[PDB]
Design a protein around this ligand. Structure first.
Ligand SMILES: *[C@@H]1O[C@H](CO)[C@@H](O)[C@H](O)[C@H]1NC(C)=O
Ligand SMILES: *[C@@H]1O[C@H](CO)[C@@H](O)[C@H](O)[C@H]1NC(C)=O
Lengths: 105, 99
């Protein structure tokens, strides 16, 4: 259904045949980021639910794979599995808890 | 020595044309596909080659089949050993069996 990520197609009639118009999705403008497989916080390893960990050099974000939309690494877009002593390449950061400002107010 | 079969074939008007791509070009295309699918993943088949670490690519591959992606991150050495053993078994089976 064409080259790229397929979205829609439209048939057209031709003599002794058919013509398809495949609408696809092509990524355009790229950038370089530093990435990690997991985040170590409070003796625990955090893996993203959907997305990928990236860093611009100083701070760490989580964004979807096919588009650069960074956001804060919280407990609602990460899940905990085990400790930090097994995963190769795990880095140190902090994971935000949304219940902390609501409990303090 | 004796007359070959191919000389009797060519002397009666039956020739064989060479293919357009030599085997070096076939190996070059195969090497380009291998380098793309190792370095980038599936991103080079949909546009520009987007680099990614191979462990994270294989974590995406496990996420595609219904396994959570941490299972690779606690079994990475075992999975690499199993892949290397399977490649060696393919090499042994190709060196032994010819049918
Ligand atoms: C990323 O880094 C590589 C190596 O330094 C460089 O060749 C490339 O142009 C950079 N940018 C992108 C968008 O890949
Ligand atoms: C992450 O923090 C732990 C303890 O807080 C420390 O032992 C470890 O070395 C840190 N990681 C790095 C890469 O420095």
């Amino acid at each position: 259904c064409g080259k790229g990520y397929h979205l829609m197609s439209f048939p057209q009639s031709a003599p002794h045949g058919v013509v398809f118009l495949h609408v696809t999705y092509v990524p355009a403008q790229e950038k370089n980021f530093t990435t990690a497989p997991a985040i170590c916080h409070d003796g625990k390893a955090h893996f993203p639910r959907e997305g990928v960990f990236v860093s611009n050099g100083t701070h760490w974000f989580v964004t979807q794979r096919n588009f650069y939309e960074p956001q804060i690494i919280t407990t609602d877009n990460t899940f905990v599995s085990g400790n930090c002593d097994v995963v190769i390449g795990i880095v140190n950061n902090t994971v935000y808890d949304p219940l902390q400002p609501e409990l303090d107010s | 020595a004796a007359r070959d079969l191919i000389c009797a074939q060519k002397f009666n008007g039956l020739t064989v044309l060479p293919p357009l791509l030599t085997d070096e070009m076939i190996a070059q295309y195969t090497s380009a596909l291998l380098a793309g699918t190792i370095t980038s993943g599936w991103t080079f088949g949909a546009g520009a080659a987007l680099q990614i670490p191979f462990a994270m690519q294989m974590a995406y591959r496990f996420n595609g089949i219904g396994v959570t992606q941490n299972v690779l991150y606690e079994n990475q050495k075992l999975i690499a050993n199993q892949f290397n053993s399977a490649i060696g078994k393919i090499q042994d089976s190709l060196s032994s069996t010819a049918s």
